[PDB]
UniProtKB/Swiss-Prot annotation, chains A, B:
Effect of residue 15 to A: No effect on anti-HIV-1 and chemotactic activities
Shown segment, full-protein numbering: 22 to 89 of 93
Documented effect of changing residue 20 to A: No effect on CXCR4 activation
Effect of residue 7 to A: Impaired CXCR4 activation ability, but only slightly impaired binding to the receptor
Protein name: SDF-1-alpha(3-67)
Effect of residue 14 to A: No effect on anti-HIV-1 and chemotactic activities. Slightly impaired chemotactic activity and no effect on inhibition by heparin
Consequence when changing residue 25 to R: No effect on CXCR4 activation. Impaired dimer formation, leading to increased chemotactic activity. Eliminates the pH dependence of dimerization
Effect of residue 27 to A: Impaired CXCR4 activation
Curated annotation (Swiss-Prot), chains C, D:
Effect of residue 7 to F: Sulfate incorporation greatly reduced. Moderate reduction in sulfate incorporation. No sulfate incorporation and binding SDF-1alpha greatly reduced
The species this protein was found in: Homo sapiens
Disease annotated for this entry: WHIM syndrome 1: An autosomal dominant immunologic disease characterized by neutropenia, hypogammaglobulinemia and extensive human papillomavirus (HPV) infection. Despite the peripheral neutropenia, bone marrow aspirates from affected individuals contain abundant mature myeloid cells, a condition termed myelokathexis. CXCR4 mutations play a role in the pathogenesis of Waldenstroem macroglobulinemia (WM) and influence disease presentation and outcome, as well as response to therapy. WM is a B-cell lymphoma characterized by accumulation of malignant lymphoplasmacytic cells in the bone marrow, lymph nodes and spleen, and hypersecretion of monoclonal immunoglobulin M (IgM). Excess IgM production results in serum hyperviscosity, tissue infiltration, and autoimmune-related pathology.
Positions annotated with a glycan in the UniProt record: 11, 18
Function according to Swiss-Prot or TrEMBL: Receptor for the C-X-C chemokine CXCL12/SDF-1 that transduces a signal by increasing intracellular calcium ion levels and enhancing MAPK1/MAPK3 activation. Involved in the AKT signaling cascade. Plays a role in regulation of cell migration, e.g. during wound healing. Acts as a receptor for extracellular ubiquitin; leading to enhanced intracellular calcium ions and reduced cellular cAMP levels. Binds bacterial lipopolysaccharide (LPS) et mediates LPS-induced inflammatory response, including TNF secretion by monocytes. Involved in hematopoiesis and in cardiac ventricular septum formation. (Microbial infection) Acts as a coreceptor (CD4 being the primary receptor) for human immunodeficiency virus-1/HIV-1 X4 isolates and as a primary receptor for some HIV-2 isolates. Promotes Env-mediated fusion of the virus.
Induction field: (Microbial infection) May be down-regulated by Human cytomegalovirus/HHV-5.
Extracellular membrane side: 1-38
Entry's free-text remark on domains: The amino-terminus is critical for ligand binding. Residues in all four extracellular regions contribute to HIV-1 coreceptor activity.
Homology family: Belongs to the G-protein coupled receptor 1 family.
Region described as Important for chemokine binding, signaling and HIV-1 coreceptor activity: 1-21
Designated name of the protein: C-X-C chemokine receptor type 4
Residue list for modification Sulfotyrosine: 7, 12, 21
Amino acid sequence: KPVSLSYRCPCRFFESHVARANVKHLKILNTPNCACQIVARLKNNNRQVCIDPKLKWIQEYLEKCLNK
Amino acid sequence: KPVSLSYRCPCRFFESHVARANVKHLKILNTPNCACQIVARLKNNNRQVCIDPKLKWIQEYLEKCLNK
Amino acid sequence: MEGISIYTSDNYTEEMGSGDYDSMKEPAFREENANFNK
Amino acid sequence: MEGISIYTSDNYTEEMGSGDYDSMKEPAFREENANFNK
């Protein structure tokens, strides 16, 4: 995969109807071109997909880890 | 490595005086024994360290990713 | 969102990954889509 | 808050891990460190 920093995002499009329980963990990356993207490693060996950091289950996830 | 329910935790303790600029990304996992742990991969090749999910830069990191 | 000095993407390179699962955007924190296939 | 059902340990098991870099606890969102050296 040829890459550069001029136009770099881990995903241009992030996934929203993806299951919370179907992930093994969250991997979050902040690229210069795109705000914030979370990438989850899906169960078994399917692949790893980008989850919207603004998704519902992510919202509660971040918040709870932060303090509450 | 056997991790059932008795003892599964991705970290021992969470690191606080660790640099935001020295990490490549955040990897978050929740084990049954431990609340929330973010583990970050240090730049180049050192290892991966556990970051307090409640660290300053993490707080705002979660916040920015959340929406704000 | 802001052009703030972030970290460097060392191991994780990327530039434009794709999306599935009805790849959508904007906080979906409060939405009531209660399984409606009609 | 409470421990909800978690993700199956496939890629990541771990019952051990790191804990250095002056390992501390609680939100450090607000720190007012005014020269700690005496």
